[PDB]
Design a protein around this nucleic acid. Structure first.
Ligand SMILES: [Mg+2]
Ligand SMILES: [Mg+2]
Ligand SMILES: [Mg+2]
Ligand SMILES: [Mg+2]
Ligand SMILES: [Mg+2]
Ligand SMILES: [Mg+2]
Ligand SMILES: [Mg+2]
Ligand SMILES: [Mg+2]
Ligand SMILES: [Mg+2]
Ligand SMILES: [Mg+2]
Ligand SMILES: [Mg+2]
Ligand SMILES: [Mg+2]
Ligand SMILES: [Mg+2]
Ligand SMILES: [Mg+2]
Ligand SMILES: [Mg+2]
Ligand SMILES: [Mg+2]
Ligand SMILES: [Mg+2]
Ligand SMILES: [Mg+2]
Ligand SMILES: [Mg+2]
Ligand SMILES: [Mg+2]
Ligand SMILES: [Mg+2]
Ligand SMILES: [Mg+2]
Ligand SMILES: [Mg+2]
Ligand SMILES: [Mg+2]
Ligand SMILES: [Mg+2]
Ligand SMILES: [Mg+2]
Ligand SMILES: [Mg+2]
Ligand SMILES: [Mg+2]
Ligand SMILES: [Mg+2]
Ligand SMILES: [Mg+2]
Ligand SMILES: [Mg+2]
Ligand SMILES: [Mg+2]
Ligand SMILES: [Zn+2]
Lengths: 141, 175, 209, 37
RNA sequence: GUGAAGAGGGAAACAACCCAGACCGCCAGCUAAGGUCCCAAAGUCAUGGUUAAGUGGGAAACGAUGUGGGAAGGCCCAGAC
RNA sequence: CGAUGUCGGCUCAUCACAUCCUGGGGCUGAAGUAGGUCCCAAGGGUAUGGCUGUUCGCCAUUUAAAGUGGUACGCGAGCUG
RNA sequence: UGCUGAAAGCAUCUAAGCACGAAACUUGCCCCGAGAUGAGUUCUCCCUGACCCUUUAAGGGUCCUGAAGGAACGUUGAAGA
């Protein structure tokens, strides 16, 4: 018989990471791994065994190349002409918290379980949080 | 290459402060400061500055030459100072100064008022000729470019703001 | 800038010695009392809420009565809110008057328009009408077509068709003020303001002018 | 500024330059020779 | 040769393309095509160079002091450029 | 083909740029107004009448301009025949 | 369109750096709008009584209590199928 994970008895820990000086494509992948629980032996496809991850200094994320001017983020409102276009620097200046969220949501599976995994990311834009009551552990990338 | 290898002499009465890669120069005209690219190294021989390309950078000699030229400009501006003259040409055109601003009537309905940075000193010895003095070269070049843009010298009669040392490729209208 | 809340009474005219009959919509702006001041520390923005008029003691609810008693203000007929700028301060017990617009020339009036009910396309979006003759059948006032055949094969979002027309908040800017009567608590504004007589309107200094 | 595909030198006072990844041709004595890719 | 009359894996989806021919069951293992950052299972594998265009991830005649090289040649410390 | 209803016209629009105007610029054999060519730019606007079933087209008179094309040569379970 | 400026001793708007620049873009003008499930913020108001039962718990039942407020009916509206 193969062991499975029960959502009631599973445990989740709190980790805090600073996104200063690291890349989106090499940080969001680790975040998705630790959100899906692929770093634990108790990994199961249908159970969210991941850990609650907090991200600090999302505006300090480092990106190489000319992506700061050529990295567009297309989306559609729903209307016929409701198409919008932005760039990396505009996103950082206006809504910096929505630059890690897009990457992690794209990397995570699509569905209710993926949304539940995404619900655990407490992405902030500074160097301080209000979740000190959870006693988080500092993590390196 | 050759420019970078050519050294920079700092004359008497000039004080140099080098913290990290940042460079600050003080003296007679004023104080200047400028940071350089992380692909160059600057050394002081107690009487002359030298520049060297660092390891791990392909475009090192070009950056060193640019830094040498910038430091030479800074030291000569601090010691003597940069100057530039504008020879306004055209009927009905004049110039005036009020403290640190420039007033012009370049054939416009409204008078043209232009501000100046804190390190620029202007003078109008003649109605059709003005002069400016400063410590930096890029600032005075930008100021002259703005003055030139106000009234571009036309290729038919030369009316407009033009440099006192440049030339105009004037033409003649057909019949 | 700090606006005020008034009650629309009707439209009329005012004559000038030059021989001009300027239209005007008289607005009755009573003593507008302060109920609460919101600061940047607690609420996150600088604003002030205003109460106008009077209400029945047997009709005002207990939470409203307590909120008014916290300030020391009688029970009005409603609550409005206005944002604040730098250099503008107030207290909780103040009662602003119509004299604030003494040096104001152009104002903006915001209010709920008059409800026209479920209106047709022609009345709602100023559409045109097909011919009433030459063979037309049951399509004298219909909007006609809505889209294209199987490309996209649907209806675009934001299409203009029939629906509710009225009972919505509209703002008219740059209306010229004619006169201010502090004794009668009256404001004279040239033009036409949205809403029927007796409605509540918000008069503010012009944002652009 | 004539914009075309093939850019070259016409007179002896022309300097071919590359700015922002675009090839340009500027002559110091003939405005007609100003070319762009 | 395949489909027709052929299931399965791969090319994101895909009758004919590649690997490969389903008697049935097993929560056993080994491979081919194809892949090993995440979706999605596997190297953020080691040494060696190229690219700075997101080239990779749609295309020509043609044009360019874009660079990474190979082999030569002219002129040149009586001084070249 | 055990039916996907067809040209033109009316209402209703939407998208694109190889742009008609407005916006900015380069060259001019651009003295100025007025012009010619080319680059960027779709935010907005982009005519009324006589003839013809006609799109197209001819003419009259305006307009800052009277755009090019796609949407089953858009739109008949919206109308017209 | 430029300023300074090397690779290329010069030159050069660019490779380091700086500045100007369109009705194009984001704001700025108006409206909707926390089911924005990431379901938000603030000022207020309201009931501060006892009993037993197994399945010992986000448990079941009894008496008393029925508040703030809302709902329903009626008069109705320049609100409205
Ligand atoms: Mg009504
Ligand atoms: Mg009609
Ligand atoms: Mg009939
Ligand atoms: Mg009829
Ligand atoms: Mg009939
Ligand atoms: Mg149809
Ligand atoms: Mg440019
Ligand atoms: Mg057959
Ligand atoms: Mg097969
Ligand atoms: Mg076979
Ligand atoms: Mg297959
Ligand atoms: Mg394919
Ligand atoms: Mg498949
Ligand atoms: Mg194996
Ligand atoms: Mg293999
Ligand atoms: Mg999937
Ligand atoms: Mg994996
Ligand atoms: Mg590696
Ligand atoms: Mg058929
Ligand atoms: Mg059928
Ligand atoms: Mg038929
Ligand atoms: Mg174009
Ligand atoms: Mg657009
Ligand atoms: Mg705009
Ligand atoms: Mg007739
Ligand atoms: Mg058709
Ligand atoms: Mg038809
Ligand atoms: Mg149909
Ligand atoms: Mg017939
Ligand atoms: Mg130079
Ligand atoms: Mg230069
Ligand atoms: Mg305008
Ligand atoms: Zn030339």
């Amino acid at each position: 018989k193969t062991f499975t994970a029960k959502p009631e008895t599973v445990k989740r820990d709190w980790y805090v990471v600073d996104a200063t000086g690291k890349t989106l494509g090499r940080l969001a992948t680790e975040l998705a791994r630790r959100l899906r629980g692929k770093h634990k032996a108790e990994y199961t496809p249908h159970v969210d065994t991941g850990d609650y991850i907090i991200v600090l200094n999302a505006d300090k994320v480092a990106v190489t190349g000319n992506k700061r001017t050529d990295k567009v983020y297309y989306h559609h409102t729903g209307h016929i002409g409701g198409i919008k276009q932005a760039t990396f620097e505009e996103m950082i200046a206006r809504r910096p918290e929505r630059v890690i969220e897009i990457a992690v949501k794209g990397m995570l599976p699509k569905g209710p379980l993926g949304r539940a995994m995404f619900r655990k990311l407490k992405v902030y834009a500074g160097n301080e949080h209000n979740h000190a009551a959870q006693q988080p552990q500092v993590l390196d990338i | 290459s050759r420019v970078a290898k050519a050294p920079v002499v700092v004359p008497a009465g000039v004080d140099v402060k080098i913290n990290g890669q940042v460079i600050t120069i003080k003296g007679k005209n004023g104080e200047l400061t400028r940071t350089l690219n992380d692909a160059v190294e600057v050394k002081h021989a107690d009487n002359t500055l030298t520049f060297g390309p660092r390891d791990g950078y392909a475009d090192g000699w070009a950056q060193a030459g640019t830094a040498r030229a910038l430091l030479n400009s800074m030291v000569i501006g601090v010691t003597e100072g940069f100057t530039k003259k504008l020879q306004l040409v055209g009927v009905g055109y004049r110039a005036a100064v009020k403290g640190n601003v420039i007033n012009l009537s370049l054939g416009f309905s409204h008078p043209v008022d232009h501000q100046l940075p804190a390190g620029i000193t202007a003078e109008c010895p003649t109605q059709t000729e003005i002069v400016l003095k400063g410590a930096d070269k890029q600032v005075i070049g930008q100021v002259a470019a703005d003055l030139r843009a106000y009234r571009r010298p036309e290729p038919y009669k030369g009316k407009g703001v033009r440099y006192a040392d440049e030339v105009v490729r004037t033409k003649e209208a057909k019949k | 800038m700090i606006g005020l809340v008034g009650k629309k009474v009707g439209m009329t005219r005012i004559f000038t010695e030059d021989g001009v009959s300027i239209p005007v919509t008289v607005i009755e702006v009573e003593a507008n009392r302060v109920t609460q001041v919101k600061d940047l520390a607690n609420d996150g923005y600088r604003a002030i809420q205003v109460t106008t008029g009077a209400k029945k003691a047997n009709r005002v609810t207990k939470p409203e009565a307590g909120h008014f008693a916290k300030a020391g203000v009688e029970a009005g007929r409603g609550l409005w809110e206005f944002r604040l700028a730098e250099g503008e301060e107030f207290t909780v017990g103040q009662s602003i008057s119509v004299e604030l617009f003494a040096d104001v020339k152009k104002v903006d009036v915001t209010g709920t328009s008059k409800g026209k009910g479920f209106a047709g396309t022609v009345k709602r979006w100023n559409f045109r009408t097909q011919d009433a003759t030459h063979g037309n059948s049951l399509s004298h006032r219909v909007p006609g077509s809505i889209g294209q055949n199987q490309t996209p094969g649907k209806v675009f979002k934001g299409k203009k068709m029939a629906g509710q027309m009225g009972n919505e908040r509209v703002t008219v800017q740059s209306l010229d003020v004619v006169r201010v009567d502090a004794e009668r608590n009256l404001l004279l504004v040239k033009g036409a303001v949205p809403g029927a007589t007796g409605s509540d309107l918000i008069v503010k200094p012009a944002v652009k002018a | 500024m004539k914009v075309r595909a093939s850019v070259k030198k016409l007179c002896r006072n022309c300097k071919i330059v590359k700015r922002d990844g675009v090839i340009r041709v500027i002559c110091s004595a003939e405005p007609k020779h100003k070319q762009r890719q």
